[PDB]
Design a protein around this ligand. Structure first.
Ligand SMILES: COC(=O)c1c(O)cccc1OC/C=C/c1ccc(F)c(-c2cc(C(=O)O)no2)c1
Length: 298
């Protein structure tokens, strides 16, 4: 059905329309906390804020603000905390969140520098010998190892609560080939990546919500979560036909503004889901075909 609609929409080149329509019906909620003068420097983009009703509150008494939303997908029983790329001054806040929320995985969908501009702080350690200590949130983050693949890298980090000397293994999934405001090379590579994250247990309910982010935490991050939820629902009832992707994107837009920034990302979202269904519906071999087509070997 989504395939029909796909060809339908492609056949008459109406993605820009379908996309603007979703924008017209997207929820709109107040962002008072994020817009408070004291939090001006805690936001990377003036036009990208968390709604008040679904923002992740830091557990400190000083200022509990951080540009992050908890997208809670009720029907699919999956939660994601989408956030902006940490600013030089908010890296402590970022790891505080991860710790307090009990996250197991962190999904980075952008490179530190894109189009010749600094899109995100270097918030994680790059060399084992050089760990990082966030003095304001009293946390330590050490690089334990990293598995570099052609288009993405998986890092194992150790987060420690200097106040209690408690430690946690944090998996860092970094997609290094997704153009800014762009779309993955092929659904195959994107799906290979999604399933890698899935296989890590990072998306399991026995863990806090996975923290997903790009520069603003709405475009590429939205695409990622949309495909994951759609594939998940489709899986829950083994009924591809009952999955209304636009209805699902709107559900998500209730928790964070502007998820999916371009009509092409929306088109890619359809592709990834349609392609992913192959695996969800019983063809377990397609996962290897993706791993091949993705060319993850250096
Ligand atoms: C397309 O716009 C919307 O859907 C929308 C809406 O309908 C209502 C309210 C706000 C809206 O978005 C504000 C985003 C601003 C905005 C400004 C600068 C940015 F670098 C980005 C950005 C970058 C990325 C990435 O890294 O891929 N994703 O988003 C988004």
């Amino acid at each position: 059905e989504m395939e029909k609609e796909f060809e339908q929409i492609d056949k008459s080149g109406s993605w820009a329309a379908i996309y603007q329509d979703i924008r017209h019906e997207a929820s709109d909620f107040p962002c008072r906390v994020a817009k408070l003068p004291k939090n001006k420097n805690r936001n990377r983009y003036r036009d990208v804020s968390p709604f008040d009703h679904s923002r992740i509150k830091l557990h400190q008494e000083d200022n509990d603000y951080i540009n992050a939303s908890l997208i809670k997908m009720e029907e699919a029983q999956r939660s994601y905390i989408l956030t902006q790329g940490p600013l030089p001054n908010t890296c402590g806040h970022f790891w505080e969140m991860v710790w307090e929320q009990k996250s197991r995985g962190v999904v980075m969908l952008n490179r530190v520098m894109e189009k010749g501009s600094l899109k995100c702080a270097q918030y994680w350690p790059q060399k084992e010998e050089k760990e990082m200590i966030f003095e304001d949130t009293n946390l330590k983050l050490t690089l334990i190892s990293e598995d570099i693949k052609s288009y993405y890298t998986v890092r194992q980090l150790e987060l420690e609560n200097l106040t209690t000397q408690e430690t946690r293994e944090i998996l860092h999934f970094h997609y290094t080939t997704w153009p800014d405001f762009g779309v993955p090379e092929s659904p195959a590579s994107f799906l290979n990546f999604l399933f890698k994250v899935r296989e890590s247990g990072s998306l399991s309910p026995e863990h806090g919500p996975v923290v997903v982010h790009c520069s603003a935490g709405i475009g590429r991050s939205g695409t990622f979560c949309l495909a994951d939820t759609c594939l998940l629902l489709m899986d829950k009832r083994k009924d591809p036909s009952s999955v209304d992707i636009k209805k699902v994107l709107l559900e998500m837009r209730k928790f964070r503004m502007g998820l999916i920034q371009t009509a092409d990302q929306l088109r890619f979202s359809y592709l990834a889901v349609i392609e992913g269904a192959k695996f969800i519906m019983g063809d377990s071999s397609v996962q290897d075909q993706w791993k091949e087509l993705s060319h993850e070997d250096l």
